[PDB]
Structures are given as structure tokens and as C-alpha cells.
């Protein structure tokens, strides 16, 4: 089957700063909460950290040459906050700015549109010392950071996201302790989520007041759960699972309120959203688009023991990736249709890919399972576009094998293999497959 | 996840006569339309036929010993019609009967309940010469055959199916020409479907009048199609695809009428169901259960060029079996819930498995993909049971690698490998996996 | 057996422009009908195109160094028309000319005689928009192109071909829709064939009037079919098959008329050659030699269903190449003797080789099957030379693995492996074998 | 392509006595000239002999069971002369007769028609001591042998051949010294050829006079040579090559004279046929059919140094079998049409196969090259049948890997592998392929 994409469909790949950039102490970079986390025994697999990662602080020109041969039109990257404000608050670091000017100018020289993520999880440790996103002062530190980038990069970047994956920043990091800063306290997690949303709406204001170029949105990770039985309780469990990832952030943005059922759920557990007067109005600032990060889908049942959402995922026997996620691409189709509750808004798939850990054998990385995964999810993209939904582009997660957070370097997501021993880049067989798709601008499934 | 099945859940495997029985000219067996078909150049891959197949005419004792070690409770098999009535009409062949007495007695000796399929596609060629199922005389020949088996096997068989896969018998065989008798004429296909349904209802009558033991139903193959877009036309295409396999036979049985939209569809193509007065009443004869044959699921779109149903299947990029079918087990869950339109009727999964063509390597057949397939579909079975649906058992398709109709021996479905060179049986790794499941009577999915 | 070739025998390799040149938008190159074709979903395998191909636009020096180590005396290449006349009609592009000056000067510097093909299938899309070879205006556009090259390259090129494979240009492209422009209309195919023949004779005139250096001919692909039975109808079917490839173009050239039996055949199908007064005289312009392109041979029988020539090829069970062609080299011997009907004309084998898809393993490409194929066909060449036929040289198809038209890059013909990932060249084992043959100027078959 | 054979086409396999029978001293068997030859250092590769061969003297029942599973209709075998007349002349050995009665009765029990070759090269050494076929007394010894077999096996054998491969018996054995008795003298070779022809015609007389059942003919090996150039001298060389194998024996039989050109040729070399009055009349005895033994084809040129026929074979570069013969199946088609010079006589292909030396790997012999060879030659058979030639059956050379004369056991021809270490039989993959062809009675070539 041949799937022809729209003429102006935006193909890309995506990275984040702390996962790829190879120089954590260089040019006066301050420490993030993730340097701290990764440097703590027991937090990250094998004690891996992003000290060197892909050395993309130094090897960005080769990566841009590689993503130019790809035939790609955008590149999503994040900005290291503590490179720009090494304390989070104080005086700007021009060296930090200069690096991103070197990157962006190169991208722009090569006809690749920067898609910039301001916040991808590297909060300056200095601000964490003051309570991080639990402290409202961090909202102001963020708006300053945002302003600085809006003004510095005015005509160079046309696509902006405030926050990558608010669910992770708040709940995975502060309720589940899995990600930096590694806390396990519901109220803290809810504080963090509320404050990043205020920070978000205030940064969109600044963007509009400064007349910055391009468009600006936010990029939630998106969950999809489908009930094991037909019971109302299994249905409720799935509603909780879905809504906390997306609706909990998107309904304040789009509709001026938090999901009441989840508000009530957390009240049961004795936690309340720290909403001040004027907050919901600020959060409701009109945004131009959103990014959607999608990897996986699940079948869940109510289970009072199954975590703070009491929603257990069923091992259905599906084939999983090397990180252990079942591949079921329909979840993308389903969640995109779900999100039509906020209107036929502009949506970019700002992350989608697979942990497939193949390595270089006879000069190539024969990652057929990555081609398979991608091909399945691109069919769902074409499908939604042909349902008339405004899905505007797709960024493959992961240009490069990189530092996969609590997994370390063990879990490979890249279309380009990186030997962390040598820093040598080997474009995988998916790379050349993707090159074809993004250059032809149609996909074909064959037997 | 541990899936505990009901105490009295019925585990099995399934075969058909012409696919496994090794002796097509033996003991006065007449020719079926499938001997004829398989003996015609171009009809079956490689000119394979069931002349020898698995030689189960001779090796049934070893197979019954193997399925006894399996820990299984039923065995679904079909009866070769032209063994019993070598012309279809005339005098009974006692040698034919004796063979099935040898098989049944053995099964019953071993605590395995026979699940008998009267018609699994081997129409006596003699009756085909007279027009086969297009001729109503064949209805009478069938009722006679049915009676003979009901009376001969009275207390020995407690589970009976009239017809296996009416959609194939009628449409695949007479409209698409893919199966014997290999015709391509809608009206003939509709005649055949109508007449097998009258034959079915008349045979259930006889069953009740003779006070035969056990329960009697029919075993349709079941299709499930889900629309590519949200359009009414794609929806309509999927309704046609689903309904012709199941509703077209089940709605006459359960509700006394053919699906009107499909009636109208075929009228458009100039074909009409040859319904005589009294026919629909006969077809509405109460049955005790149905079997459901499920392998696969599809995403379809309306396409006026896509065959007589104008319903095109989309290659979605999913992993396929070795015969080329995507595995998506949810379709089983979905179609079982669909069929609740006829009531919470008793349902056996009388076929489900996968073509996985692994062969013997170092004394074993490491058919991990078959274990994977089966495990996924058994979760769907537990799931429906726990939705309160009366799903009563599960027969794995295929005890043995066998003669896969127009594929010949190329496509292996068995849990026991058969080297057709030697007739040697090698239980595959799925066999020992299934042994565990059916003996423990619970399944576990693990990573 | 030792086969000694003539002292002044001309050994070569061959490429075409769109198959190898790596820069389809570069230096004001206009689009050909093959860019268009290859950019259309479904036309070429895997959506491959010649956008980059072997990048021979940039890597020609390395290729010329490689073909210099080969010990070769000519190089057949084609000229990209839309590089010279980016619209087909308008003003010359000097950058296009300069490239071929860079190539030719290099060749001439290295003692390798250019063998130039003016037309190898890349009609400017602009002219196709006006009807392409169906339009007589394209005849004039072509003569202009030809002139430009004759005058630019006067003393540098001594060997010229107007058209490569007229049968493909006309019938494969316009009747069978397989090649650009992908039409399926007999009359159009016949128009195209007639107009390229007028274009051809007019270009030979110009060549003579301008006093251009060297010799000029045309290079048909040559078919050879041998009848399955001894019937007149099978014989007739083979006559049609053979004659449409060669005689249909060669008999106008050499004898001033089209093959009447094929004229009558096409009249039956309602198509007529658009012959204007003076046309056949123009086409009969004396030419200095022809090239012959030979790959394969077939056994055919009359079959009224077997396409517009009603000539079915029999699968005889012969070993095939990786593109699926039987190797039977006698067909070369046979067709060279056949063509003696036009006189003992000068003939170059301007293409012969095999799709053998071996890749680099331990630093070499062990393409023994290519050595085998070549060795068999070179025996046939020596054989005809020793029958006193004026066979003047041999060009191996394919210097380089390249863009094999509707096959894309899947089908490798090269004596030098190209990794299209890297553009790395690895001379195959046939390269070093050919080096020996062309340098010793004799071949030896051994067991 | 599907090739349907005639309903009553005769499929078989073939062996000879000394090549397979495992018991050279057993039951009073006298020595043949091949025991003698094989027991002489330097005559046979590796000093192999037929002392044990396949032990088919003892294992014939298993072989007949194997050729029964094949689905075959005839079996060609030879009779060991010195088993029946251990001196050639004297008193019959009943134990010898009994063995062949055990073999024939078994065959006939299994519905396999014996196709009996009286002479397959094992002349009693005793007669060789008296000059063998150079002595006319051996003609009488032979007629006696023939009678004995005609009378003993009257109603049991319906298909008889006097001599297998007269060219070998005479010229290969007595001119070229390659086969027993290993002489190199033209005149002797011509004597042998003339005397075996008188022996042949006299034996056909006896056959008719005794009213023996069935039909009787002779089975020449058949050569086909095609000239390298178009010269008369190359043509003449090929005529000599072809005619000595077939015409030299067939023209006395069918036309009452030896090929004059070959008569003159040998007269030049000072040799004359020892023709007595009445001889040519005896040789012209009407025969019912012939067998044709075909393996290979060649391209030859005149060369005054190229042996006693001055006809050199050109190594054309074609792929060869493991004994080093090029496979070119058209030679079968060509020679069958050639032989129509004797009328549309009944012809059986009483030998055709390939030396392919594959061995047992993982329990099978993957002899794809043998399937390939056979498939090509069976197409030629269908082809001639469909040209209306009376080709009546086909016997594959070789049921079993066996003693390949001067090659010993090194060169395997069998469709059943024999481990001469163990005498274990392993039917090769060609066996199961042939089983399909001979049982369906049609062949299919596929890609």
C-alpha cells in the first residue's frame, strides 16, 4: 500500500541537550538536576551519566551533515538551561548562547528548520536547591530563560516548545522518583505540574509581546490505555491513565480547568493543586500547536494496588522492543482522534521511535525492527491526516543513540549508531529507509 | 500476567479429513471435489494433493497417543463423506464407517471427546457432476450422510458441527474459484450458501428427531475488518466484509433472514438467493452452540475496484505469519463481542493458529512465533470469558502439519511437525508449551 | 580453449547518464521524463530514482581512474539532454557542456576513446509536456541537441550513437507503460518509433554536413526467440518478437521500409505508421556501424493472449540471473548471423552483461556468475569474428552498479560494486578477470 | 509453465548389473571383462570395482520399495551375463536365473514393468579370452544367452533391449581403451561393432520365433555436436561425431547399410567392416522401438589432431556437472528430431541424468542442480511429444548412486544417495521432486 504524505509535511528527528551534548563542565555550564541525579549511585543504570554522551557539543557539524543527507526538513533539539543561566537566575553565559548560535546557523545554512524545546528536563541544580518547580520563583527564572532565547534567536527559530513531557517532569520525577529530582510525593508532583503550566503560559505571553517569529506550543508525552474488561471500573482506570499524561496539562491550556475527576481522585489522596487567582487565566494562553510524544499503548484494568492511579497494565503477550514496550501503533491513531476534544488543533509528532539495540555487524546496523516499528506508526499518521486531522509533521526519536535517562546508554533509540567508545557515527539501515521516505514524501508497505 | 481458565474449559486441536488422511483410494473411498481440484494443474501450489497427506488413515493411533500426552480434552476432526457414501447418494461403505469407529473408540478410550465436523469440504465428485451444492438434491444426499453418522455414532460423539466455514464453501470456492470446485459466479456461490444452510437446518432436525446424543452447531470462519478512515463508505465496506463471513449464515440461523444490505448489494450485481417457501423456517432450527474459526484481522477501505465487495485491505505494516497474515489478536475479542448480537450463545473457538514454517533443527522445532501467536489469542479468550461471554473451549489449528488446501504442504500450521518424506512426527516447541497450558488450565505472560 | 581476439578489437564498459550521474538539479539541469517517472509512486521499485545514483557527476575522475586500470580502450556513456538544453528547445547550458568536456578530456588524456550515446532515454520533461516523441517538433529539438554536441565535441569523440534501444523508447515506454513516459497506446508507440527514426536520419545528415569526426550509428536492443514447436504459428510468433526489436528500426535504415508483416500486424490492431513524404528517404541515411545490446534469448510459442505480439515465452527451466533472465549465449551468435541480412555491417556489442547481486564480503565481491556469463558471451563474439563477421568491439554493461530503471538500485550489473550508502567503489572479481582478458586480448576457458 | 505429459507416458529409473549388484563371486557368478578391468591397477579411478557396489544382489527389495514410493511405472535394469552363463557358453546357472526371478516378481508384484537390458557391458571373461566380440563365436554365445532369458522370462518382461550403448562397447572400449576390455585398435572396435549388430539382429529373430511377449529394441548412447564455425569442415567433423554414436548402428538396423562417409573415413585409416554375406540382412531385422541415452551436447570444430574423428570439442564456458559435462538440454530436442530420418519410430529415453555429488547434510541431500538438470530435459521431452514425435517414456539415470565405470564411486548419478560405507539409502531431494512429476504426470517450471 502506498501512503502519499502532504506536500508540506514536516519530516524530522529529535534529540535533547543532556542526552547528546558532550561537555557538561565546559564553557561555564552549570550543573542540572540530571547531572546530580546521574552522579548519585543507584539512580541510573550502571552509573551512566551525560558527562560525555554523544559529544554533540563538539560533533554537531557532522551530525548536521548526516541529517542533511537524510533529506530531513526540521531538527528538534533542546536548549541546556544551565549553559545559558549557569545558576538558573543570574547573568547570561554568552558561551552558552554562542554554541546554540553555531548549531542553529548551521541548521539554517542547510535548509533544516530548528524546532526548539526550551525545557527538556535540565533544571539548574541551583534552582532545585531552592525547591525547583515546587518554588514559584522558578517560574520567573524560566520566563527569563525563555525571553533570553526568544530575543537571541528571534529570526532564526520558527518553531518553539516550552516543555517536553510535563507528565514526566512532574509525576515520573516527583511522585515516582524515577527521574530527576527523584522525589516521591504526590503534592510535590502536583505543585511541579501546576508551576510548569504557569511558567508555560507566561512564556507564551512573552513570546507574543516580544513579537518573536514562528509558532509556540507544548509537547506532552501521550498515553493510551484500553480497558481489559467492559466494566466501568476498568474504564475509569484507563481514563485516569490517559488523562494524567495529556488532559491534566491540556485542559488547563485549552479549557481553563484541570480534569475534575482527577482533581477529586487526588483530593482523595489528600493533595490539592496550588492554584492562585489569575493562574488558570495565564495557563489558558492561546498556543499555535502542540507536539505529541508517542511510543506505546496498553490494556489496563482497575487494581487498587496498582500505584497511585490504581490502574494495572496487562501483559497481553504482544512483541516488545528492547526496552520492553509492546508495539501497537493503533494507539497513535486513537489518541490523535481523542485529542480532537480540544479542536482540530495543529499537531506534530515530536517523538516516536523504538529501543532496538542492534549494533554494527559488517559495517552496518541491520535494525529491521526499527524500520518495522516506524513504518507501522507512519501508516497511522497518514491515516489521521486522511481523516482530516491537522497532523503537521513527524520527528523520529532519535537522531542518535544517546543517554536514555535512567537506562543510560544501554537502550538505543537512534537511527544513527554511536559507538560511545569512539564517538563514531554509523547510520543504521533505518536511516537509509527513512531517507527514502522523507525524500520521496510517500511510504509503501509491501510483503 | 496469570490468566486462569474455567474448570470445565475444553482444550483441543483440530484437523480435517482430506488434509491429514493418508489413503484417498483405499477401502473404496470415492473421489471428492478436492481430489479433482488438487489433481488439476494450476489449482494447488506445486501440484500437491491429499493422496497421502499425513497418512492419518494409517497413523491415527500414534497421533492419538501424541494428543493424549498433550493433556487435551477434545479432538476436532472431519468425516470424509466419500468414504461413507463413495458416490454421495448410494449404499453405505462399512469400511469407511469402521475407520471412524477405530478413531472414535481410541479417542474415547483415551478420555478425549470427539468433536465431529460432518462437512469439511470433501463433496463426493459424483454429486458435483450433478451440480453439487448448486443442486438441491445434494441437500438430501447430505441429510442421509448426516443421519448415517448420527445413528452409527450415537453414544460415542457428543459434539457435532454440520459445516466448517460456509463462507469458503460458497464464496471462496464458487465466486473466487480459489477452492474446489473452483467456480467464479456469484449466483452459484449464493446458491451453494443457501443450500448448505437448508442442509444444515434439516440435519439439526434429524439430530433432534433421532434423539442423538450431545449437541450440534455450525462452525463459520469469522472475519473482522476495521475502517481505515472514519467515512461511512469505509464503514460500509467493513460491514460487508464482516457480515458475509458470519452474519450471512448466522442471521438466517438465528434471526430467520439474510442481511438485507448484503441482499441488496448482491441484487445490484444481479444475484438473488434461491429461497423457496419454508426454507427460512428450516434454516432457523435451534442449534446448541457455534464454533468460530479465527486467524486474522484487517483494516479496510471502500474501493470500487476491490473485488465483488469493493472493500480493500490496507497493508498496515504489521508483522505477518509465513502465509502472510498479520497477527492482531484483538480481532478475536472484537468479533466475539460482535456476535453477542445473536445472544450470549455458546461458542467454541474451533480453529485458531498460525502458519510458522520452522522445521526440525537439532531434534526440535523452535517455533517461538507459534507460541507467541497462541499466547496472544488465548489472552483474548480469557478476556471474553471474563466479560461473561460463553466461550466454552479452544481448538488449536492444527494437530499436525498438513495439506493446506491451495497452498499444499508448503504452509505449516501444526503443533506437531510431520516430515512428509518419512511421515515422522516431531512435536514442536509449541506442543510442549500448549501441554503446560491445557494441563495447568492457566496461562502466564512474562517478559 | 584459447580464444585470441583481433589486434584492434575494441574493449569497453558502458553507462548511461541518468543511471550514474549524481546531481539531477545541479548546474541548471532540467527534469527528464525519467525524473518525473521515478518521482511517481508505483513506477519504480521502492521509489528509487536517479537523484544521486552513483554521483558520477562528481566522482567521474575516480571512475576514469578505475577504468584506466581495467586496461580498457573505449567508454560508452550517454549525454544528459536536459543538462545541455534544460528545456529541450531553448538556450544551451554551458555548465552542462563543461561537465562532458571534463569527462571527455579526462578519457582522452587516459587513452580511452569516448563512445557517445546522444539519446539514452532522458527526454526533457518540457518536450514531453508538448507530447514528446509523439510530436514532430521533438525531432527538431533533437537535431539541435545533436548539432550542439557534434560541434562542441568535434575532434574529441570519434564514435557516436544517436539512439540507445529504440524498442524500449517506443514500445516498452509507450505501449507497455513500463518505462518513462509510461504510456500504453500502440499508435503512440508507433509514432514515437517513427519520429525517433526521422530524428536519427536527420542527425546523421547533420553529422556528415558538419564534417564531424569519427563514425555514427544507432544501438538497438536485440531480441532472439526460437520456436517451441515446429509450427508455422510458433515460427511467426518468433518472427514478430525478433523483428520488432531490430528489423522494425533496421529495415527502414538499411532497406527503406518497415517490415510489412509487422505493418500488417499493427494495421490489424488499427495502428498505422505516421509516414510523411520524404521520411523513409531521410531514415535511409547511410550509417557507419551499429551497436547491438544483447542479454538474453527465449523459446516462444504463439499465444493469442500473450500480449500485443501474441508470442508467449516458455520457462524452459534454464538457470537465470538475479533479475530473472535465462543465460543462453548462443542467441548472440544467432542474432549476429541473422543481422547479416543488412550486409556484413560493422557491429559493436555496446551492451552485454548480467544482473548478479553479490555484495562485498571480506573486502571483495565474489561474482563468479558474472565472470561465467561474460566468458560465455565472449566465446560467441570470437566465434562470429571467426565466421568473418565484422564485430568490432564489446562493452560490458555496466562499469558500475547503478540505477536499473524500473528496478531501481536492487538489480546490480556492475563490474564495480557501488555502496549507494557511501558511494564507495569496490571493483568486483569480474573486474580483475575482465582486466586480464582486455589486456591480454585473448580469453581462455578452462575446467 | 505447465507441461502436461501423455496419459500413458512411461516414467522410470535405470541401473546396470555390474554398477549396482553387490556380489561378484556369489552363487557361481563368473568374472566379466569389467571385473578384470576394474581389478587392473590404473584402469579405474582409485582402484574402485563392482565387487560390492550397492549390494543390490541382496538389497533389491528395499530398492523396489523405494522405487514403488517414487510412483514410477518401469524399471530399467540389466542382466549379468556371467551369472547366467558363468563361462558365456556352457551350462545355465539356475541361481543366476533365480535372482532375476526374485527381482522381476517383486517388480511385477508392485506394478512396475521390467525394462530389461540383456547386454550392459559385462561380457564373460571366458569369451574375452577367446577374443570377445572380435570373435563371431561370441555372437552365438549371445543368442543363446538371449534365448535363455526370452524363454525364462516370457510373460514377466514386456520390454527388452539387446545392447546398451554400442558406441561405448565398440569404440570407447576397443579404440580408446577407456572401458573394458581396454583395447586401442580401430579395426577391433569396428569388428566389435559389426558383431554386436549381427548378435542384435539374430536375437530379435529368436525373440520373434519364440513368440516372446512384449517389444524389443536397442539402446544407443546419442551424441549431438553443433559446428563452431559455418565451414564445411567443421560441419563434417560434427557429422562424424554424431553419426558414429547413432547412425553407425542405426542405419544398418533401419536402412541396411553403414554410413558411407564414415565407411570411407575408416578406410582412409585402413580399417574395414568385416561384413559377411547375409549380415546386413540379419542386422535389418525389424525392431519395435529404440532407447536413447542422452546426457550432453557439444560445439565442435575440425582438428586433424583431435583424435581418430578429427573433431575437437570447444569449451564454450557453459556450466558443467560434477563429472564435467556441460548441461545444454536442447541437444535432446535436436537429436530426437534428427533421428526422424529413420521414421517416427518409438523412442524411450532410457538414460538421462547428471553427476551431482552432493552428500547427506542434516539428513537430506539437497541436490538442486539435479532437479534443475532434469527439469530442463523433461521440457525438451514434452516439446518433442508436442511436435508429434513418438517419445514413449523417460528413465532417470540413476536410481542409486553406483559404480560409474572408470570413475568408480566418485561420480554420483543417483536420485537415491548410497553411503557405500554403510549401504544406507537416502532418497535425495530430486527423488521427491521426481515423485511429484511422475505421479502428477505433469511438470511445472517456476521462478
Curated annotation (Swiss-Prot), chains A, B, C, D:
Alphabetical GO biological process terms: cellulose catabolic process
UniProt EC number: 3.2.1.21
Primary enzyme class: hydrolase
TM stretches of this protein: none
Superkingdom field: Bacteria
Active site: 165 (proton donor), 351 (nucleophile)
Coiled coil: none
Keywords from the UniProt entry: Carbohydrate metabolism, Cellulose degradation, Glycosidase, Hydrolase, Polysaccharide degradation
GO molecular function, one term: beta-glucosidase activity
Signal peptide: none
Keyword Hydrolase: yes
InterPro entries from the UniProt entry: Glyco_hydro_1, Glyco_hydro_1_AS, Glyco_hydro_1_beta-glucosidase, Glyco_hydro_1_N_CS, Glycoside_hydrolase_SF
Function: BglA is intracellular and cleaves cellobiose probably through inorganic phosphate mediated hydrolysis.
Membership in a protein family: Belongs to the glycosyl hydrolase 1 family.
UniProt xrefs under PANTHER family: GLYCOSYL HYDROLASE (PTHR10353), LP05116P (PTHR10353:SF36)
The protein's assembly and partners: Homooctamer.
Protein name (Swiss-Prot/TrEMBL): Beta-glucosidase A
Naturally occurring in which organism (per UniProt): Paenibacillus polymyxa
Gene: bglA
Amino acid at each position: 500500500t502506498i501512503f502519499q504524505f502532504p506536500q508540506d509535511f514536516m519530516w524530522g528527528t529529535a534529540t535533547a541537550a543532556y542526552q547528546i551534548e558532550g561537555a557538561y563542565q565546559e564553557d561555564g555550564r552549570g550543573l542540572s538536576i540530571w547531572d546530580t541525579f546521574a552522579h548519585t549511585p543507584g539512580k541510573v543504570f550502571n552509573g551512566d551519566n551525560g558527562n560525555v554522551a554523544c559529544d554533540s557539543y563538539h560533533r554537531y557539524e557532522e551530525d548536521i551533515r548526516l541529517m542533511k543527507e537524510l533529506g530531513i526538513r526540521t531538527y528538534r533539539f533542546s536548549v541546556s538551561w544551565p549553559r545559558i543561566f549557569p545558576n538558573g537566575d543570574g547573568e547570561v553565559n554568552q558561551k552558552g548562547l554562542d554554541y546554540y548560535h553555531r548549531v542553529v546557523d548551521l541548521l539554517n545554512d542547510n535548509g533544516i528548520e530548528p524546532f526548539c524545546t526550551l525545557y527538556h528536563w535540565d533544571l539548574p541544580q541551583a534552582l532545585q536547591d531552592a525547591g525547583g518547580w515546587g518554588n514559584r520563583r522558578t517560574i520567573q527564572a524560566f520566563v527569563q530563560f525563555a525571553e533570553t532565547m526568544f530575543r537571541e534567536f528571534h529570526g532564526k527559530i520558527q518553531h518553539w516548545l516550552t516543555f517536553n513531557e510535563p507528565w514526566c517532569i512532574a509525576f515520573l520525577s516527583n511522585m515516582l522518583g524515577v527521574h530527576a529530582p527523584g522525589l516521591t510525593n504526590l503534592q510535590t508532583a502536583i505543585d511541579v505540574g501546576h508551576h510548569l503550566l504557569v511558567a508555560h503560559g507566561l512564556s507564551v505571553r512573552r513570546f507574543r509581546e516580544l513579537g518573536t517569529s514562528g509558532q509556540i506550543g507544548i509537547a506532552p508525552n501521550v498515553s493510551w490505555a484500553v480497558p481489559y474488561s467492559t466494566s466501568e471500573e476498568d474504564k475509569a482506570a484507563c481514563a485516569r491513565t490517559i488523562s494524567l499524561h495529556s488532559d491534566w496539562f491540556l485542559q488547563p491550556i485549552y479549557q481553563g480547568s484541570y480534569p475534575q475527576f482527577l482533581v477529586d481522585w487526588f483530593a482523595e489522596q489528600g493533595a490539592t493543586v496550588p492554584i492562585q487567582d489569575g493562574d488558570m487565566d495565564i495557563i489558558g494562553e492561546p498556543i499555535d500547536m502542540i507536539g505529541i510524544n508517542y511510543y506505546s499503548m496498553s490494556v489496563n484494568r482497575f487494581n487498587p494496588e496498582a500505584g497511585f492511579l490504581q490502574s494495572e497494565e496487562i501483559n497481553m503477550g504482544l512483541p516488545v522492543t528492547d526496552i520492553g514496550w509492546p508495539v501497537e501503533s493503533r494507539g497513535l491513531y486513537e489518541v490523535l482522534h481523542y485529542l480532537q476534544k480540544y479542536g482540530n488543533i495543529d499537531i506534530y509528532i515530536t517523538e516516536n521511535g523504538a529501543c532496538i539495540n542492534d549494533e554494527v555487524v559488517n559495517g552496518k546496523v541491520q535494525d529491521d525492527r526499527r524500520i518495522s516499528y516506524m513504518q507501522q506508526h507512519l501508516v497511522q499518521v497518514h491515516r489521521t491526516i486522511h481523516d482530516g486531522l491537522h497532523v503537521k509533521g513527524y520527528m523520529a526519536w532519535s537522531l542518535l543513540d544517546n543517554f536514555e535517562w535512567a537506562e543510560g546508554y544501554n537502550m538505543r533509540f537512534g537511527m544513527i549508531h554511536v559507538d560511545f567508545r569512539t564517538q563514531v557515527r554509523t547510520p543504521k539501515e533505518s536511516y537509509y529507509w527513512y531517507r527514502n521516505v522523507v525524500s520521496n514524501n510517500w511510504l509503501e508497505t509491501r510483503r
